[PDB]
Design a protein around this nucleic acid. Structure first.
Ligand SMILES: [Zn+2]
Lengths: 417, 178, 509
RNA sequence: AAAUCUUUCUCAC
RNA sequence: GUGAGUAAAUUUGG
């Protein structure tokens, strides 16, 4: 029983009749309507259902018997009641918003506010810090991009062959020869053979990143879609040679060599080693029964394989071509070459972007968009947005970053903006 | 007695919490969508079933024909306002046996804002994607508490002063406020 | 190829990056940056602007929405086995339920009222106290942030305690209300295009634009700044408790707790962080770390820089630039007159994720592009045909179909290549209705949903009367009675489980 | 062995 | 820490 709801009870039953004239709800806060000779068990009494109705604020239960019906008035002008009828009556009746005392307000101050504020004051606070000196200058020019590309090239260097990027071109072998070469290479590396499949077993790791270098561009990528589809298929079909119309791959699971009792099947997190074939004439040459081909491997994370295998090469190429300028011919190292360069190498670059699972080319593209839209930039700071080597690690992402920078350089050289 | 374990120490919990404890969590499959669809020929069987059974029962829709000339303009936000149901028809729909959750969702008004840079002479609203082509789209607060006879309730008289009664013309309980 | 585009292109055609790298390194570097900022050697974390032009919502009733307090998102639950804190990861729903169980409370509103009503920090609220709640709410867990385009390096998100989440929800709701009141840009939910149009209208009266970004936004918004803003908008003891928990936050990295007194952890108090700058000055159009403003003279630019510095909105020198002929906000690029900038822009490609999902999603993307000025309709039709050909090459094996119906798509064994215009104007076989962006769900979507849906659960509480609020308190007997009553009513109609209700068919008749 | 703290399956005691 | 076995990803994508 609280005296703060009296008025609220009064408006709850203005002139509501139950039998012919008699008011349905008796208010316990008025002597005339209050029921004498009976204990009061709620704010109001309903005679048709012979029940007690009590009003409570949001999160403020009142001490009334469990039988008493509780009608909650939420802070967002919404009411709740176990009985739909009383809910509707209160909803229509309480349209005139009359604030009731005891409603918790966001500005409420607890008895421990001062203590917590003192604790906060005694705790450490930050220092001011220096105000930056911002100089606005013109965006980077062709010379700066060339400088960044040259720095990357001299810091990391180039590989002798294109490695797995060469797998986007025909290897010059038929299906049977390709399968034989892949199987014999797997046997040569002493891969475990089990249930008709290959498994690569490892014991210890040097715990250091693999050598990073820039991959030279093959002439073209005729089999980009085939290779991506093969990887997508290999996401789950690992251990046996997968065949396409013009090329094949072998994705072998990589498992720990625990001992006699060792893992026998791939799990969700098991990595893959994807082995592909390309034309011979590099360090990674393999020969068997007179069949020669370059065998190139790629250690793929299951998320990496899933991401790579789902890319749509053809649609991306067409969308880019919709509103593209003329692509110039380029050399093996992404340099303008109008004499012996090839325009097909751009396809290869796109394929590289599909193979790179970190998509650093996206960051380079965003920064280049800012560069093309910018009238002025911060001196010596905007230029440090193309330096993304620290953000990536690996031969494929490094090559993708280098060739994105080369594409920016070529755009500035051929179609200045 | 899972209620005593999930909500140990509490005898009453809000409907929001209880429903949140029956969401039937969805597990992120470790396979790609393609491999999942291939697994057990689930998609192939679903396609066979859809072609054999579901497809014939499709309510063929009419084809759009209305068109108006348009010209490229600045970017605008075309606004589609779908009103939500009201208490009366919501109660009627629930009573008729329709899913309560769907009606609860439909009670909320829907606003769709779509960026389009295309205008007509009369500033018509266009269909999804067909903006370039120009396909155009063109007292007492008596409250119904329920559509059923609540037992032991007074009948509605000619002049119901302020109470709650039952209406014979319309099979509904009427609350006559004010 | 993105480099040789005539117009603006962000290179969004390919999917975003992926990685399973553990989040420990990202969290450790973030905490190191926060610590460096605290010592005042890298950036500014001391708020100096005057937040006097902010309405005081001290008398507004404390409004708590319970929808955001329960979800499947991860959260940190803290236990004290033998005086040593152990942090576990669990669904936010389970965390909130455990919090309510520990301190007997019907709903979060009762818990908030009790916490604000106790007369001491050691007073019991069940099997806990405000002191224990504050001690446990400062523990966070690290997790890998969702991958996004243009961010090769993995970022870290932080999962908080249910008590911290509740207080954050309250303060953020009130801060969003204040933000909406202060300016019309943050009405309720502004998309990228709407915000871009509003910014273009706002900054039209000046020469230069200052497309800018804030660096180390989460590491520079100190607990002092949050408390200052909350006091400005009148948050009472809730703001003090939240600031105290933020100042004492500890992050569990791998298996060790590291103190991070500096800054906030992630985008929790986005509304408060925006409100800092917004109440400092009415010169920026800022959404958290992304802002835009215009100026006429170098003195105005210097004033803008000083205003940003005083508001702890450190300018990002790496990716902030001045433009005169274009505007840019939330990846949306516009012309000064308001027109969308020519080029692909933010167009994103559709990866292969099903024979029919791919077609539906590419149709939706092409419809969105053509509705704007991104590309002409004929280009979209050609792209749709090309995508259909690719899907035919990818999905036309017996493992996906065994049919040869003429009306079927070429990728499901048929020989139909529907025109984009024909598909859009409902001028195709009914089988193609599912491929329309506004059409029903495709077969692949239903199959994947069934796969995902396939514990000693409680009695289902579905099919509820639309007139019952979700805040009503129900016991086991109440749930059983509601189920029985609904079943009896459905039987009275001689009907099985309730029939699905779709608004479109209801409006049709 | 590699895009290197990742490639970490199950059962019983 | 010790021992043993080898439901889940191959079935089924050119
Ligand atoms: Zn080689």
């Amino acid at each position: 029983m609280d005296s703060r709801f009296a008025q609220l009870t009064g408006v709850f039953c203005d002139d509501f009749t139950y039998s012919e004239g008699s008011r349905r709800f008796l208010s316990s806060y008025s002597t005339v309507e209050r029921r004498p000779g009976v204990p009061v068990e709620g704010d109001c009494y309903d005679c048709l259902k012979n029940k007690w109705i009590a009003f409570e604020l949001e999160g403020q239960p009142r001490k009334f018997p469990k039988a008493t019906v509780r009608c909650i008035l939420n802070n967002d002008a919404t009411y709740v009641c176990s009985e739909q009828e009383y809910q509707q009556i209160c909803k229509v009746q309480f349209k005139d918003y009359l604030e009731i005392d005891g409603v918790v307000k966001v500005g409420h101050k607890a008895s421990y506010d001062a203590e917590l504020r003192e604790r906060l004051l005694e705790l450490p606070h930050p220092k001011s810090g220096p105000k930056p000196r911002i100089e606005w200058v013109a965006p980077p020019r062709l010379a700066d991009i060339s400088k960044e590309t040259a720095e990357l090239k001299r810091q990391y260097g180039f590989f002798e062959c294109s490695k797995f990027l060469a797998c986007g071109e025909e290897c010059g072998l038929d299906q049977e020869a390709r399968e034989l070469i892949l199987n014999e290479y797997a046997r040569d590396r002493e891969f475990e053979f089990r249930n008709g499949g290959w498994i690569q077993r490892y014991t210890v790791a040097s715990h250091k990143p693999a050598t990073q270098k820039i991959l030279p561009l093959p002439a073209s990528a005729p089999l980009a879609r085939e290779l991506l589809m093969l990887i997508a298929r290999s996401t789950t079909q690992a251990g046996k040679v997968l065949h396409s119309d013009n090329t094949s791959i072998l994705a072998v699971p990589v498992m720990r060599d625990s001992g006699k009792h060792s893992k026998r099947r791939p799990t969700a997190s098991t990595h893959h080693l994807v082995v592909g074939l390309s034309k011979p004439g590099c360090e990674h040459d393999f020969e068997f029964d007179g069949y020669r081909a370059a065998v190139h491997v790629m250690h793929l994370d299951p998320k990496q394989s899933a991401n790579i295998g789902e890319q749509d090469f053809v649609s991306t190429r067409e969308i880019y071509k919709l509103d593209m300028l003329e692509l110039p011919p380029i050399s093996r190292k992404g340099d303008l070459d109008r004499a012996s360069g090839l325009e097909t190498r751009w396809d290869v670059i796109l394929l590289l972007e599909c193979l790179d699972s970190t998509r650093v080319s996206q960051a380079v593209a965003q920064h280049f968009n800012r560069h093309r839209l910018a009238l002025s930039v911060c001196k010596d700071e905007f230029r440090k947005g193309y330096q993304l080597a620290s953000e990536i690690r690996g031969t494929i992402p490094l090559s993708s970053l280098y060739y994105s920078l080369c594409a920016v350089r070529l755009r500035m050289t051929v179609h200045p903006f | 007695s899972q209620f005593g374990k999930s909500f140990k120490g509490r005898t009453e919990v809000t409907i929001t919490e209880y429903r949140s404890h029956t969401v039937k969590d969805v597990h992120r499959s470790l396979l790609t969508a393609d491999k999942s669809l291939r697994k057990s020929f689930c998609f192939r069987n679903a396609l066979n079933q859809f072609l054999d059974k579901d497809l014939p029962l499709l309510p063929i829709r009419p084809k759009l024909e209305s068109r108006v000339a348009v010209k490229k303009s600045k970017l605008r936000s075309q606004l589609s306002f779908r009103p939500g149901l009201t208490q009366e028809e919501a109660i009627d729909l629930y009573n008729k046996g329709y899913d309560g959750d769907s009606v609860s969702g439909a009670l909320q008004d829907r606003v769709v804002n779509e960026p389009v840079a295309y205008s007509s002479a009369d500033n018509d609203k266009f269909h999804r994607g067909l903006a370039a082509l120009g396909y155009t789209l063109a007292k007492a607060k008596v409250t119904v508490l329920s559509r059923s006879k609540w037992m032991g309730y007074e009948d509605l008289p000619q002049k119901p002063p302020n109470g709650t009664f039952y209406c014979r013309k319309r099979k509904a309980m009427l609350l006559i406020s004010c | 190829m993105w480099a040789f585009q005539e117009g603006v292109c962000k290179g969004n055609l390919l999917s975003g990056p992926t990685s399973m790298k553990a989040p420990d390194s990202a969290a450790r570097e973030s905490i190191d940056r926060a610590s460096e900022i605290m010592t005042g050697k890298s950036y500014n974390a001391v708020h100096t602007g005057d937040l006097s032009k902010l309405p005081n919502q001290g008398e507004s009733p404390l409004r708590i929405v319970d929808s955001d307090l329960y979800s499947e998102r991860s959260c940190c639950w803290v236990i004290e086995k033998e005086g040593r804190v152990v942090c576990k990861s669990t669904t936010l729903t389970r965390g909130m339920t455990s919090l309510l169980n520990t301190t007997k409370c019907s709903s979060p509103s009762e818990l908030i009222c009790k916490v604000l009503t106790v007369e001491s920090l050691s007073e019991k609220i069940g099997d806990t106290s405000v002191e224990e709640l504050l001690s446990h709410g400062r523990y966070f867990k690290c997790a890998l942030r969702d991958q996004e385009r243009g961010k090769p390096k993995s970022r870290a998100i932080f999962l908080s305690h249910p008590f911290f989440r509740l207080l954050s929800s309250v303060v953020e709701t009130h801060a969003r209300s204040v933000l909406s009141k202060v300016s019309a840009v943050y009405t309720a939910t502004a998309s990228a295009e709407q915000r871009a149009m509003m910014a273009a209208q706002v900054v039209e009266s000046r020469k230069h634009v200052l497309n800018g970004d804030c660096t180390k936004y989460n590491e520079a918004i100190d607990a002092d700044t949050l408390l200052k803003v909350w006091d400005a908008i009148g948050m009472g003891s809730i703001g003090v408790m939240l600031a105290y928990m933020v100042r004492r936050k500890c992050v569990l990295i791998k298996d060790t707790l590291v103190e991070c007194p500096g800054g906030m952890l992630m985008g929790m108090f986005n509304a408060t962080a925006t409100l800092a700058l917004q109440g400092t000055t009415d010169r920026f159009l800022s959404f958290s770390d992304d802002f835009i403003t215009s100026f006429n003279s170098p003195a105005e630019l210097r004033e803008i820089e000083d205003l940003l510095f005083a508001s702890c909105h450190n300018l990002s020198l790496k990716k902030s630039y001045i433009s005169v002929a274009s505007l840019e906000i939330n990846s949306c690029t516009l012309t000064r007159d308001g027109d969308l900038a020519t080029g692909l822009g933010c167009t994103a490609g559709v990866p292969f994720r099903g024979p029919l999902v791919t077609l539906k999603q590419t149709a939706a993307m092409l419809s969105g592009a053509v509705d704007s000025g991104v590309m002409p309709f004929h280009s979209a039709e050609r792209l749709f045909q090309i995508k259909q050909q690719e899907c035919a090459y990818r999905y036309n094996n017996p493992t996906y179909t065994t049919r040869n119906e003429d009306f079927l798509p070429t990728c499901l064994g048929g020989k139909t290549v529907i025109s984009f215009q024909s598909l859009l104007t409902w001028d195709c076989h009914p089988f193609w209705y599912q491929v329309h962006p506004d059409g029903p769900d495709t077969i692949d979507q239903k199959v994947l949903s069934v796969l995902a849906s396939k514990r000693t659960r409680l009695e289902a509480l579905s099919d509820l009367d639309p007139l019952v609020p979700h805040r009503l308190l129900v016991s086991e007997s109440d749930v059983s009675k509601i189920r029985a009553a609904r079943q009896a009513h459905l039987k009275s109609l001689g009907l099985e489980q309730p029939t699905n209700f779709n608004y479109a068919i209801y409006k049709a008749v």
